[PDB]
Design a binder for this molecule. Sequence first.
Ligand SMILES: Cc1cc2nc3c(=O)[nH]c(=O)nc-3n(C[C@H](O)[C@H](O)[C@H](O)COP(=O)(O)OP(=O)(O)OC[C@H]3O[C@@H](n4cnc5c(N)ncnc54)[C@H](O)[C@@H]3O)c2cc1C
Ligand SMILES: Cc1cc2nc3c(=O)[nH]c(=O)nc-3n(C[C@H](O)[C@H](O)[C@H](O)COP(=O)(O)OP(=O)(O)OC[C@H]3O[C@@H](n4cnc5c(N)ncnc54)[C@H](O)[C@@H]3O)c2cc1C
Ligand SMILES: Cc1cc2nc3c(=O)[nH]c(=O)nc-3n(C[C@H](O)[C@H](O)[C@H](O)COP(=O)(O)OP(=O)(O)OC[C@H]3O[C@@H](n4cnc5c(N)ncnc54)[C@H](O)[C@@H]3O)c2cc1C
Ligand SMILES: Cc1cc2nc3c(=O)[nH]c(=O)nc-3n(C[C@H](O)[C@H](O)[C@H](O)COP(=O)(O)OP(=O)(O)OC[C@H]3O[C@@H](n4cnc5c(N)ncnc54)[C@H](O)[C@@H]3O)c2cc1C
Ligand SMILES: [Br-]
Ligand SMILES: [Br-]
Ligand SMILES: [Br-]
Ligand SMILES: [Br-]
Ligand SMILES: [Br-]
Ligand SMILES: [Br-]
Ligand SMILES: [Br-]
Ligand SMILES: [Br-]
Ligand SMILES: [Br-]
Ligand SMILES: [Br-]
Ligand SMILES: [Br-]
Ligand SMILES: [Br-]
Ligand SMILES: [Br-]
Ligand SMILES: [Br-]
Ligand SMILES: [Br-]
Ligand SMILES: [Br-]
Ligand SMILES: [Br-]
Ligand SMILES: [Br-]
Ligand SMILES: [Br-]
Ligand SMILES: [Br-]
Ligand SMILES: [Br-]
Ligand SMILES: [Br-]
Ligand SMILES: [Br-]
Ligand SMILES: [Br-]
Ligand SMILES: [Br-]
Ligand SMILES: [Br-]
Ligand SMILES: [Br-]
Ligand SMILES: [Br-]
Ligand SMILES: [Br-]
Ligand SMILES: [Br-]
Ligand SMILES: [Br-]
Ligand SMILES: [Br-]
Ligand SMILES: [Br-]
Ligand SMILES: [Br-]
Ligand SMILES: [Br-]
Ligand SMILES: [Br-]
Ligand SMILES: [Br-]
Ligand SMILES: [Br-]
Ligand SMILES: [Br-]
Ligand SMILES: [Br-]
Ligand SMILES: [Br-]
Ligand SMILES: [Br-]
Ligand SMILES: [Br-]
Ligand SMILES: [Br-]
Ligand SMILES: [Br-]
Ligand SMILES: [Br-]
Lengths: 414, 414, 414, 414
Amino acid sequence: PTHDVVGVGFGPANLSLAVALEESPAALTSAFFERRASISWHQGMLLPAAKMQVSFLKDLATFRNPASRFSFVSFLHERGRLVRFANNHDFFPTRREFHDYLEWAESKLAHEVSYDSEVTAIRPGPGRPVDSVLVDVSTPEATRTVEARNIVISTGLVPRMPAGVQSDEFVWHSSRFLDHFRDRDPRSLRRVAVAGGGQSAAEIVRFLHDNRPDTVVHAIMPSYGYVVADNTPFANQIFDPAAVDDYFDGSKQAKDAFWRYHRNTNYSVVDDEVIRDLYRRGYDDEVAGAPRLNFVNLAHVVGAKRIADDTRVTVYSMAREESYDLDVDVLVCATGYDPMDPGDLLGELAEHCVQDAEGRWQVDRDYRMVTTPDLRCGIYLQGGTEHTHGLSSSLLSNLATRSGEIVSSIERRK
Amino acid sequence: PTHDVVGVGFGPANLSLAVALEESPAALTSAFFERRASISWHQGMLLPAAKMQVSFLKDLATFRNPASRFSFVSFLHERGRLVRFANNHDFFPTRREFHDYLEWAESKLAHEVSYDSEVTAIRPGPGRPVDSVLVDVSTPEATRTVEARNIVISTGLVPRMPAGVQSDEFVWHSSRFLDHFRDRDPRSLRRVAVAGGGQSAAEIVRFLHDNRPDTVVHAIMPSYGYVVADNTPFANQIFDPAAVDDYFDGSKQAKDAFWRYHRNTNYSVVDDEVIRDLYRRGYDDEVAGAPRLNFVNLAHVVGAKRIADDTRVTVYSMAREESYDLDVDVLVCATGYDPMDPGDLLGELAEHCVQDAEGRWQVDRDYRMVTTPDLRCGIYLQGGTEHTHGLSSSLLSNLATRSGEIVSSIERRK
Amino acid sequence: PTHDVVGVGFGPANLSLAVALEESPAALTSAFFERRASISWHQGMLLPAAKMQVSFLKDLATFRNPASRFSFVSFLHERGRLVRFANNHDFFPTRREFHDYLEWAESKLAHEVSYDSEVTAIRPGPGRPVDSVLVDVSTPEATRTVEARNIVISTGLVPRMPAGVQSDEFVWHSSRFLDHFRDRDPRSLRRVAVAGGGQSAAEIVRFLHDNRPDTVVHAIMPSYGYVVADNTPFANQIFDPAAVDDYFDGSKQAKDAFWRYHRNTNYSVVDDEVIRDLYRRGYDDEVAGAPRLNFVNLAHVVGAKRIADDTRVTVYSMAREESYDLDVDVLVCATGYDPMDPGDLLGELAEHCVQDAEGRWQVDRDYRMVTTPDLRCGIYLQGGTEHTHGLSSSLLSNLATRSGEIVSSIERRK
Amino acid sequence: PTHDVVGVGFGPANLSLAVALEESPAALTSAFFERRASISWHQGMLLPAAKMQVSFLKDLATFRNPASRFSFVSFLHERGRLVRFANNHDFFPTRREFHDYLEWAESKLAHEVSYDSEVTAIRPGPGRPVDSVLVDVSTPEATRTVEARNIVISTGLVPRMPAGVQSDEFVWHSSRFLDHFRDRDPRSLRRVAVAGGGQSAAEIVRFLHDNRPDTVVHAIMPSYGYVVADNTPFANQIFDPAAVDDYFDGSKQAKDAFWRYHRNTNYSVVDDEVIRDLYRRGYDDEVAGAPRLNFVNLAHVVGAKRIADDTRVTVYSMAREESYDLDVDVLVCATGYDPMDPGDLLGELAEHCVQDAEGRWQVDRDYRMVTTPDLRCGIYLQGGTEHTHGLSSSLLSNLATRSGEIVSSIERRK
Ligand SMILES: Cc1cc2nc3c(=O)[nH]c(=O)nc-3n(C[C@H](O)[C@H](O)[C@H](O)COP(=O)(O)OP(=O)(O)OC[C@H]3O[C@@H](n4cnc5c(N)ncnc54)[C@H](O)[C@@H]3O)c2cc1C
Ligand SMILES: Cc1cc2nc3c(=O)[nH]c(=O)nc-3n(C[C@H](O)[C@H](O)[C@H](O)COP(=O)(O)OP(=O)(O)OC[C@H]3O[C@@H](n4cnc5c(N)ncnc54)[C@H](O)[C@@H]3O)c2cc1C
Ligand SMILES: Cc1cc2nc3c(=O)[nH]c(=O)nc-3n(C[C@H](O)[C@H](O)[C@H](O)COP(=O)(O)OP(=O)(O)OC[C@H]3O[C@@H](n4cnc5c(N)ncnc54)[C@H](O)[C@@H]3O)c2cc1C
Ligand SMILES: Cc1cc2nc3c(=O)[nH]c(=O)nc-3n(C[C@H](O)[C@H](O)[C@H](O)COP(=O)(O)OP(=O)(O)OC[C@H]3O[C@@H](n4cnc5c(N)ncnc54)[C@H](O)[C@@H]3O)c2cc1C
Ligand SMILES: [Br-]
Ligand SMILES: [Br-]
Ligand SMILES: [Br-]
Ligand SMILES: [Br-]
Ligand SMILES: [Br-]
Ligand SMILES: [Br-]
Ligand SMILES: [Br-]
Ligand SMILES: [Br-]
Ligand SMILES: [Br-]
Ligand SMILES: [Br-]
Ligand SMILES: [Br-]
Ligand SMILES: [Br-]
Ligand SMILES: [Br-]
Ligand SMILES: [Br-]
Ligand SMILES: [Br-]
Ligand SMILES: [Br-]
Ligand SMILES: [Br-]
Ligand SMILES: [Br-]
Ligand SMILES: [Br-]
Ligand SMILES: [Br-]
Ligand SMILES: [Br-]
Ligand SMILES: [Br-]
Ligand SMILES: [Br-]
Ligand SMILES: [Br-]
Ligand SMILES: [Br-]
Ligand SMILES: [Br-]
Ligand SMILES: [Br-]
Ligand SMILES: [Br-]
Ligand SMILES: [Br-]
Ligand SMILES: [Br-]
Ligand SMILES: [Br-]
Ligand SMILES: [Br-]
Ligand SMILES: [Br-]
Ligand SMILES: [Br-]
Ligand SMILES: [Br-]
Ligand SMILES: [Br-]
Ligand SMILES: [Br-]
Ligand SMILES: [Br-]
Ligand SMILES: [Br-]
Ligand SMILES: [Br-]
Ligand SMILES: [Br-]
Ligand SMILES: [Br-]
Ligand SMILES: [Br-]
Ligand SMILES: [Br-]
Ligand SMILES: [Br-]
Ligand SMILES: [Br-]
């Protein structure tokens, strides 16, 4: 039984693909594999009041199908909160509510997802030219192999730590913050260092300040103070489908310009509200004569080591061009991610994937990897397309249209 | 040819009824009569920057059917502006765009509306019990009569002038501001008085200031300065279906409390943005040493007379309990409206309509007038229900659910 | 030793008077008596993050003397926070910082205040016409009498409870909220009722929600939801000195209009930020399926009794026209105040104070009580002038100019 | 007659120096020379509604002397607008009001400024070591030479045009926009190109759109849409005196970091309000089906030639790496400035001034150029210190402390 399409991973990207498949009149068979036990979207960073980067209209389907049964608006209506949400006049749901939306949409889906199923390899299919691919899957029970004419790789971002720092009991990546924080004894988090200059860093510093009034927090950033995220309407435009075209068709010079002029837009920077709240918190602490927030500007974390009951963080000060140690209970590295890369999953198939001038994968406008005539199946990428498609590649700004374009491409070439 | 329902008027209210009829699986036959040549929604006040009082989610259908083909979102999508609108992060469309939305929705409607058709009378049908009503319609050509099992009266608000003032060549009601303004020698309006303290008053003053740099404007209001409109979430709530229930089921004391505590919500007051813009305009003019905006506080217009080339406005000052004259070119009365009166059209049909203690029509929760048992036809009111259903009666805050409830009532009794 | 002027009370009003005295070149001798042990400005409501109702420019002196050494700006500069404050771009200090400002200003004052000095009576001095008053002062030590040519009464508002409700161990007025709350067991207060519809009510509900995650709060208000405070620029104008003139010189009709149109300005209503925060809190609780905030609309507290381990609050529902009981741990009445009563401290002297035809004290523009020629002393009121001077009477919106007026009047008559 | 200090130029920088001199108890003699007939601060960009980049507290003196008679607050008070300004709750004056403030402050100044006095050279005084300098001053009338122990050069920024583009009748630099615009028939500019991506560019495009309804405008910018200015509190901090210290004492790496992370602060970027207004304008035009604003993204103006009745603007598109000609009435280059350069006026004295590695002038913390022992005169720079003192060098964010520092340095050395 050869599936038209297998989806590797079930985050919001492949969820939008599943929705696009259902909504499409095309008769496509599919299966989706997710390593985790259920849908799990950045749960380590589901802080109270944390807000979505994108508006509720940039959901799973609305920009493609404005009357989708999977829209955020349909969700709110079924939950009996559409009116209440509307009265709030806020375009941005909390990340918590958005997670509930994902789970609701997954349930509404006709076709069931296979969980506890980690894809370990993608292998060529019998036949030459290769007409299909073989997907190896591991369940807690056994292993199994499935076959597909096309595959959609959407395995998400990979956590990035500072060079020379490794995660441990006392050194956490921001992606795991709440997982560790949960049932940690408070007495044991009297002092926390948070490295990074972006949204997750600021959110965590603010959560710590608000959660425990005794915790001392060192915010270690390369900039001289948090830099604001650009959320103005012309900025929001670079994440429109039309801007994907402009970036895709654009010269290397133009592509460089996108990243140069517009890199201050989401995760590497911080929302105006979060910044103001932090500054307010610092100010009121000063009035009260009880300072707690230490903003360590123009600095980087270059090492961490557990010494007795202390996590000794080595900090490099750019101003002074010297490094020095800071003892804390826990170091949190809100230091971002590396992009998705299909390379390693693809193993031998990789060799048939055409590369570009800088050694990166070529990809067509419809998110299809460029291949040699030795390979005839579709390997589509949701994520990993920063070089070809631009800044929207790992975000939730364009789920409806990217998933629709991929389904349309599959129907087309079938 | 006896219709299931006839709608009198085709403003947004009956437009939402038509949509509710189409979306309902019930086989109801209908006809709508509009006296104007085409849909025409407060066109005299379609000023350049003017904004809707309600959010785009409070459209024709979405609160009832979140996947309606008639939603504002579906409209934006067909117009190719959904993404552009979403990036703006504004819940409130301009009144101009909303008018386009109404026209778009009217076109998308399967059933055609009868325009240039003024309903002149409604009268009791043939027989006992009275199972239908006869609706007399004047068209440019000839009059005719139509029969219906149910009627929905939605003829809108009636312009109200200050006691002692009549509309003329130089005395306008705000509802006809742009109609008159477009037709004038532009250098003919160097001095304008605008009476009223509410949204239309402030919008017109602001438009005049912005429109030419030399116009002198007298804003005459009973308050000491414009009072702000309450647009907070707890206030938007009174305009929700659930709050219609609370008002409807509520004692006379409770109903009085709604109007007392929450009268400062929309048209009698002024949105924060407009107020700040006007104040800013006044301030900058003062810096420039060129004052143009005269705010006449705690005052009322009590008469108007044309003397030669001047409209002589008689203004009563509350502060000093005396009146004085002010010479201008035009006086605009942004002095609001009287509610819809279903008594207008009913004539002999009232006989069968039950009044209350104080002589106001009794109306059921489903917007159906309470009738003597000889009358079996449904007379439904969209508007005119201020006493029974509350502040939402003449607004666009609840179109989807009111229209749905009326359609459901009609089907139920069928 | 006969003083030119004696100040009764030392809140912000008499503090601004002390400053006006020091800045004036006139050689006036003064003494101020404060019952408390030190300056104490609404300390029971000094909640975290609570904000001033007035901007930092409406301080003790700036509107009179823009280069005062007692300005809020001079305070910030001496504290080394002027730049930090300026970068925040917020016109409204926290009430906690404002309290620090009052203490700083009091210290900078050359002339020392007599604390622990309760004024118990004001009596006619010797001789005719009466050229001085006698001020009876109780200290913990003894009692004494001081003599003065003029007196300024600024004793502040008086806590008002709902009719039929007395303050007790478990029934608090909002003015003492933090005083009681600090001396209480965190898990003693799992259920709290807060009566009132104004700023203090909403702030307290917010504080409770934020301070413990398990507390259940019943917000009992006469309106259908919190009503927003008007803080637009035309609204702030009614608190300008120029608007005091308009109100003072205005007919009764006019004065009525001020209170009618502009009652929605400060303490009886709730600032937009606090309202949105509460609504957001309620919404997120609903998402989490853990409701804690119970908004009891259209209702009044009409009685309270202690029964075993509970406080039984009798609530009247306007909608249902019935009353019912609500068991809580503590009832907080954020039910406002009655105005300062100049007559309180006045005995025989009242007989020489002229009333109007509704029985209210006549007061000149310069805040001087109108007296028969039998009395030549100045009795000035800071507070208690709601009928004569208007809405600004008990606020901090006009401290600089009211105090300056009073000092100028005193010098003029000397 | 040898002055203690001579100021070259009389913009806001030397204006703050004059104030600092007057407020200082030190007996310093001074003279200021301005080439224009009167104070003239960016008058070509005094557009309607244009706002200051810095708050009113960042005025001539307040951060140094919070009770200065030259503060923006004292100005407002003398103008009878302090209360009116305060009620507006806006930290940012219009540029027009700020200009009035400068004029007011200049008038209040005891010592009169020499206008129509262009400084043409600064030369060594007699003797060695060099204890004075001679300032050559050209007037319309004559020339003369004055002698000074110290000089402060504050001659402002120098307009910069795109490479290969010269200003002409139809090619304007933004600094002269209103000067040209006002000398044109109102109907003479129906088509306009505006090059640049920063504040002045956006302000001009907005002004044009708002000023006539027919004007077509091409906004040509290197970015993909306007980029927002960071005006958050941590950002405003780099402009405080404490941050000048951090930048001054900082390594080259740290200084580079300031410019790298925080270049997006003022003139190179666009404020939130302006951006949203433009996007709104574009959206409403689209709804109206009358597009006028053409945003040309990822593009540079590379040439301009007059051809008959047109200006043929040559635009380079980075996207497609092709050029095309855009015919219009006028090209406005809002392309910024080059910094102040003291070498200009210095000539022979330069040999006594010490340069660094990259050939830049060395400058002490107190803004004094570093000199050899042969030169004992103070040459102070207000402007031209971007390399040594950082981003605040050419702004008005630090007038009070920079001027005070310079005066203190002069007194110290005396
Ligand atoms: C707090 C936060 C921080 C963020 N940081 C950034 C950032 O710094 N930069 C940026 O560009 N975007 C960032 N993101 C955005 C992020 O990429 C998205 O919001 C979104 O998660 C992406 O959707 P996705 O479907 O591509 O996948 P995901 O949410 O990443 O999930 C992919 C799924 O694939 C599964 N999976 C992976 N490998 C396998 C396998 N071999 N077999 C089976 N299943 C597998 C995973 O379990 C996962 O559930 C952040 C988001 C949040 C909430
Ligand atoms: C500028 C402005 C000011 C407003 N002022 C207020 C206010 O002060 N207070 C308030 O509560 N609401 C006010 N409204 C809100 C207003 O009622 C609603 O926006 C709105 O028109 C929708 O409801 P409708 O269909 O009930 O009304 P109506 O729109 O106005 O439309 C009804 C239609 O019935 C037609 N009609 C009337 N009689 C007959 C007949 N005999 N035969 C055939 N056709 C007929 C009319 O021509 C009209 O087309 C205002 C709205 C705007 C835009
Ligand atoms: C939380 C809060 C709620 C408020 N509620 C309202 C409101 O509902 N309505 C409103 O209009 N304004 C209200 N206010 C504003 C309030 O009045 C002012 O902020 C301020 O307190 C007024 O200054 P004052 O000096 O006039 O009075 P106060 O600040 O009250 O100071 C009066 C002083 O006189 C002292 N005193 C009294 N009697 C004697 C005596 N016999 N002898 C010696 N000393 C005496 C008192 O101890 C006190 O220190 C509120 C303010 C806050 C912060
Ligand atoms: C629209 C606008 C755009 C701006 N653009 C930028 C920008 O792009 N980047 C940036 O960093 N800041 C920018 N600024 C900030 C700006 O420099 C300040 O606001 C302020 O002008 C600087 O003060 P100043 O006194 O140093 O300079 P100036 O305001 O420029 O004043 C210098 C004065 O010296 C006079 N002068 C010059 N030479 C002589 C001479 N030889 N003899 C006698 N007098 C002389 C001039 O006539 C002038 O009056 C801008 C400001 C505005 C309003
Ligand atoms: Br968005
Ligand atoms: Br709902
Ligand atoms: Br929003
Ligand atoms: Br993260
Ligand atoms: Br501190
Ligand atoms: Br440190
Ligand atoms: Br995202
Ligand atoms: Br796409
Ligand atoms: Br699509
Ligand atoms: Br709304
Ligand atoms: Br679209
Ligand atoms: Br909005
Ligand atoms: Br007339
Ligand atoms: Br009219
Ligand atoms: Br109107
Ligand atoms: Br509802
Ligand atoms: Br109720
Ligand atoms: Br004026
Ligand atoms: Br008045
Ligand atoms: Br409406
Ligand atoms: Br309803
Ligand atoms: Br319904
Ligand atoms: Br003094
Ligand atoms: Br506390
Ligand atoms: Br204020
Ligand atoms: Br400071
Ligand atoms: Br503010
Ligand atoms: Br009790
Ligand atoms: Br109490
Ligand atoms: Br209180
Ligand atoms: Br005033
Ligand atoms: Br719930
Ligand atoms: Br107050
Ligand atoms: Br006053
Ligand atoms: Br005064
Ligand atoms: Br600033
Ligand atoms: Br003033
Ligand atoms: Br501001
Ligand atoms: Br020597
Ligand atoms: Br030029
Ligand atoms: Br410029
Ligand atoms: Br492009
Ligand atoms: Br120079
Ligand atoms: Br500046
Ligand atoms: Br400095
Ligand atoms: Br200084």
